[PDB]
Design an enzyme around this catalytic site. Structure first.
Site, PDB file in Angstrom:
ATOM      1  N   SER A 147       0.855  -1.207   0.000  1.00  0.00           N
ATOM      2  CA  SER A 147       0.000   0.000   0.000  1.00  0.00           C
ATOM      3  C   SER A 147       0.886   1.252   0.000  1.00  0.00           C
ATOM      4  O   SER A 147       1.970   1.212   0.603  1.00  0.00           O
ATOM      5  CB  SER A 147      -0.944  -0.033   1.168  1.00  0.00           C
ATOM      6  OG  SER A 147      -1.713   1.152   1.204  1.00  0.00           O
ATOM      7  N   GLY A 148       0.444   2.305  -0.686  1.00  0.00           N
ATOM      8  CA  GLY A 148       1.074   3.638  -0.678  1.00  0.00           C
ATOM      9  C   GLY A 148       0.281   4.618  -1.524  1.00  0.00           C
ATOM     10  O   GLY A 148      -0.948   4.487  -1.579  1.00  0.00           O
ATOM     11  N   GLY A 165      -2.207   3.364  -4.062  1.00  0.00           N
ATOM     12  CA  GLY A 165      -3.378   2.687  -3.489  1.00  0.00           C
ATOM     13  C   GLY A 165      -2.937   1.447  -2.748  1.00  0.00           C
ATOM     14  O   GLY A 165      -1.940   1.543  -2.009  1.00  0.00           O
ATOM     15  N   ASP A 213       5.652   8.906 -15.603  1.00  0.00           N
ATOM     16  CA  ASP A 213       5.985   8.504 -14.202  1.00  0.00           C
ATOM     17  C   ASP A 213       6.969   7.329 -14.214  1.00  0.00           C
ATOM     18  O   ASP A 213       6.864   6.456 -13.338  1.00  0.00           O
ATOM     19  CB  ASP A 213       4.728   8.200 -13.374  1.00  0.00           C
ATOM     20  CG  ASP A 213       4.971   8.189 -11.866  1.00  0.00           C
ATOM     21  OD1 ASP A 213       6.044   8.653 -11.443  1.00  0.00           O
ATOM     22  OD2 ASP A 213       4.091   7.699 -11.115  1.00  0.00           O
ATOM     23  N   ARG A 230      10.660   2.465  -8.980  1.00  0.00           N
ATOM     24  CA  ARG A 230       9.427   2.074  -8.233  1.00  0.00           C
ATOM     25  C   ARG A 230       8.317   1.626  -9.208  1.00  0.00           C
ATOM     26  O   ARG A 230       7.466   0.843  -8.780  1.00  0.00           O
ATOM     27  CB  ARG A 230       8.933   3.192  -7.312  1.00  0.00           C
ATOM     28  CG  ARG A 230       8.429   4.437  -8.027  1.00  0.00           C
ATOM     29  CD  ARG A 230       7.898   5.516  -7.085  1.00  0.00           C
ATOM     30  NE  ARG A 230       7.551   6.637  -7.945  1.00  0.00           N
ATOM     31  CZ  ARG A 230       8.413   7.555  -8.377  1.00  0.00           C
ATOM     32  NH1 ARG A 230       9.663   7.572  -7.933  1.00  0.00           N
ATOM     33  NH2 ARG A 230       8.002   8.488  -9.219  1.00  0.00           N
ATOM     34  N   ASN A 231       8.344   2.066 -10.470  1.00  0.00           N
ATOM     35  CA  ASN A 231       7.311   1.726 -11.483  1.00  0.00           C
ATOM     36  C   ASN A 231       7.851   0.714 -12.493  1.00  0.00           C
ATOM     37  O   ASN A 231       7.259   0.570 -13.575  1.00  0.00           O
ATOM     38  CB  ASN A 231       6.752   2.992 -12.125  1.00  0.00           C
ATOM     39  CG  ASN A 231       5.905   3.752 -11.127  1.00  0.00           C
ATOM     40  OD1 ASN A 231       5.394   3.145 -10.187  1.00  0.00           O
ATOM     41  ND2 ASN A 231       5.816   5.069 -11.276  1.00  0.00           N
ATOM     42  N   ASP A 273       2.222   1.168 -13.685  1.00  0.00           N
ATOM     43  CA  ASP A 273       1.599   2.412 -13.170  1.00  0.00           C
ATOM     44  C   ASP A 273       1.362   3.407 -14.307  1.00  0.00           C
ATOM     45  O   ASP A 273       2.261   4.263 -14.589  1.00  0.00           O
ATOM     46  CB  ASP A 273       2.371   3.059 -12.027  1.00  0.00           C
ATOM     47  CG  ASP A 273       1.404   3.883 -11.193  1.00  0.00           C
ATOM     48  OD1 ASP A 273       0.502   4.518 -11.801  1.00  0.00           O
ATOM     49  OD2 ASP A 273       1.498   3.809  -9.971  1.00  0.00           O
TER      50      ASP A 273
HETATM   51  C1  LIG Z   1      -0.980  -0.959 -13.192  1.00  0.00           C
HETATM   52  O1  LIG Z   1      -0.679  -2.346 -13.095  1.00  0.00           O
HETATM   53  C2  LIG Z   1      -1.267  -3.040 -12.074  1.00  0.00           C
HETATM   54  C3  LIG Z   1      -2.552  -3.552 -12.214  1.00  0.00           C
HETATM   55 CL1  LIG Z   1      -3.376  -3.304 -13.722  1.00  0.00          CL
HETATM   56  C4  LIG Z   1      -3.137  -4.268 -11.192  1.00  0.00           C
HETATM   57  C5  LIG Z   1      -2.444  -4.470 -10.014  1.00  0.00           C
HETATM   58  C6  LIG Z   1      -1.164  -3.966  -9.840  1.00  0.00           C
HETATM   59  C7  LIG Z   1      -0.572  -3.237 -10.876  1.00  0.00           C
HETATM   60  N1  LIG Z   1       0.725  -2.680 -10.822  1.00  0.00           N
HETATM   61  C8  LIG Z   1       1.468  -2.390  -9.704  1.00  0.00           C
HETATM   62  C9  LIG Z   1       2.091  -3.369  -8.873  1.00  0.00           C
HETATM   63  C10 LIG Z   1       2.171  -4.836  -9.002  1.00  0.00           C
HETATM   64  C11 LIG Z   1       1.817  -5.466 -10.195  1.00  0.00           C
HETATM   65  C12 LIG Z   1       1.970  -6.832 -10.296  1.00  0.00           C
HETATM   66  N2  LIG Z   1       2.470  -7.602  -9.326  1.00  0.00           N
HETATM   67  C13 LIG Z   1       2.824  -7.010  -8.182  1.00  0.00           C
HETATM   68  C14 LIG Z   1       2.708  -5.644  -7.987  1.00  0.00           C
HETATM   69  O2  LIG Z   1       3.074  -5.059  -6.801  1.00  0.00           O
HETATM   70  C15 LIG Z   1       4.224  -5.578  -6.123  1.00  0.00           C
HETATM   71  C16 LIG Z   1       4.643  -4.558  -5.099  1.00  0.00           C
HETATM   72  C17 LIG Z   1       3.658  -4.352  -4.005  1.00  0.00           C
HETATM   73  O3  LIG Z   1       4.073  -3.311  -3.132  1.00  0.00           O
HETATM   74  C18 LIG Z   1       4.302  -2.102  -3.854  1.00  0.00           C
HETATM   75  C19 LIG Z   1       5.331  -2.315  -4.907  1.00  0.00           C
HETATM   76  O4  LIG Z   1       4.927  -3.348  -5.794  1.00  0.00           O
HETATM   77  N3  LIG Z   1       2.752  -2.676  -7.886  1.00  0.00           N
HETATM   78  C20 LIG Z   1       2.557  -1.347  -8.057  1.00  0.00           C
HETATM   79  C21 LIG Z   1       1.778  -1.136  -9.171  1.00  0.00           C
HETATM   80  C22 LIG Z   1       1.405   0.143  -9.570  1.00  0.00           C
HETATM   81  O5  LIG Z   1       0.605   0.367 -10.479  1.00  0.00           O
HETATM   82  N4  LIG Z   1       1.981   1.149  -8.883  1.00  0.00           N
HETATM   83  C23 LIG Z   1       3.115   1.011  -7.964  1.00  0.00           C
HETATM   84  C24 LIG Z   1       3.084  -0.278  -7.174  1.00  0.00           C
END
Ligand SMILES: COc1c(Cl)cccc1Nc1c(-c2ccncc2OC[C@@H]2COCCO2)[nH]c2c1C(=O)NCC2
Ligand SMILES: [Cl-]
Length: 324
Positions: free
Chosen positions: A27-28, A31, A142, A146-147, A160
């Site tokens: 979380s952050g 969302g 962005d 982190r992304n 992201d």
């Molecule tokens: C836009 O795409 C996504 C969709 Cl459609 C649906 C769910 C997640 C995402 N994408 C994202 C992830 C993520 C994606 C896949 N598997 C693990 C993930 O998260 C691991 C750690 C958790 O703790 C935070 C850091 O990432 N994480 C993040 C994003 C994200 O958009 N913003 C930053 C953190």
């Protein structure tokens, strides 16, 4: 089409009942992200997913669907693919689980076991993702470590799409309003004039490379955001990381030139990083580079590790589950 071409992307609506073993990942500001298993009924597959919620507002649903729209369109091995949406009170985004997390946390956690080959390969893969976004006329706005997400240590993807914008065929620039953006990843023309282009994304790419090559250092550490435009106008830039040859640092410095058109193109960054990746120790100097291993799909418990035993047989990576 008197303007641009029709977007014939399919938006898949996923039933809440097809999702199992939901656990919080993180979380952050983005969302909250959960992991789960998506089990399309009558298919006999179990697909590891991430599920993103926004921080039941009408404003929230609007912004999450804008991200869904952008992502539904993108099909590239180095860019996160939208699997679909779930229509809970709050709309959820569903994507392929990236089990190793974001690349910023990964390089910090594994900074004693990351060699030149991984670092240069990641630079190539990020440039491939960004080049694909440019072919689709998408400005990410962005890009940062982190992304970037880690499917496996060998395979990363850009995520992201919260700030992403589409240019028309005619159009060169996005002109932003007063919305909040990460200043320390932004091109000077973005800070000063709210101008965003593929070439402002190249600036962000340079900062992202600097994050990787420093094993996750914070850019302009402990400098207030409000002081960043001044520093850049004076001609100051992020320092050469200890592991970087002048060859690698010069690519970063080119990404931070004032003339946006003087910066490298993502297609040029693919070429340059790919040449460097063929002789990585000529380009990055890492103490112990020789004797370094990270997990690959040919490891004892690689699949056992991040799954339950009861799910092992029918599990299918989303990359191998193709638009039915
Ligand atoms: C836009 O795409 C996504 C969709 Cl459609 C649906 C769910 C997640 C995402 N994408 C994202 C992830 C993520 C994606 C896949 N598997 C693990 C993930 O998260 C691991 C750690 C958790 O703790 C935070 C850091 O990432 N994480 C993040 C994003 C994200 O958009 N913003 C930053 C953190
Ligand atoms: Cl941080």
């Amino acid at each position: 089409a008197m303007g641009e071409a029709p977007n014939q992307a399919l938006l898949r609506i996923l039933k809440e009942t097809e999702f199992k073993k939901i656990k919080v990942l993180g979380s952050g500001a983005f969302g909250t992200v959960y992991k789960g298993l998506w089990i399309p009924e009558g298919e006999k597959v179990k697909i590891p997913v991430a599920i993103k919620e926004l921080r039941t507002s009408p404003k929230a649903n609007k912004e999450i669907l804008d991200e869904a729209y952008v992502m539904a369109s993108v099909d590239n091995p180095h860019v996160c693919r939208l699997l679909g949406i779930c229509l809970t009170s709050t709309v959820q985004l569903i994507t392929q689980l990236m089990p190793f997390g974001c690349l910023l946390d990964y390089v910090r956690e594994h900074k004693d076991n990351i060699g030149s080959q991984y670092l240069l390969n990641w630079c190539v893969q990020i440039a491939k993702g960004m080049n694909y976004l440019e072919d689709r006329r998408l400005v990410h706005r962005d890009l940062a470590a982190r992304n970037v997400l880690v499917k496996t240590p060998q395979h990363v993807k850009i995520t992201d799409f919260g700030l992403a914008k589409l240019l028309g065929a005619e159009e060169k620039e996005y002109h932003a309003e007063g919305g909040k953006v990460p200043i320390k990843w932004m091109a000077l023309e973005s800070i000063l004039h709210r101008i965003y282009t593929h070439q402002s994304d190249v600036w962000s790419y340079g900062v992202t490379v600097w994050e990787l090559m420093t094993f996750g250092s914070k850019p302009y550490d402990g400098i207030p955001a409000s002081e960043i435009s001044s520093i850049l106008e004076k001609g100051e830039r992020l320092p050469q990381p200890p592991i970087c040859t002048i060859d690698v640092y010069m690519i970063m410095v080119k990404c931070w030139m004032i003339d946006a058109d003087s910066r490298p193109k993502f297609r040029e960054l693919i070429i340059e990083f790919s040449k460097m990746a063929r002789d990585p120790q000529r380009y990055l100097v890492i103490q112990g580079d020789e004797r370094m291993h990270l997990p690959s799909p040919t490891d004892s418990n690689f699949y056992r590790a991040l799954m339950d035993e009861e799910d092992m047989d029918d599990v299918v990576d989303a990359d191998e589950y193709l638009i039915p």
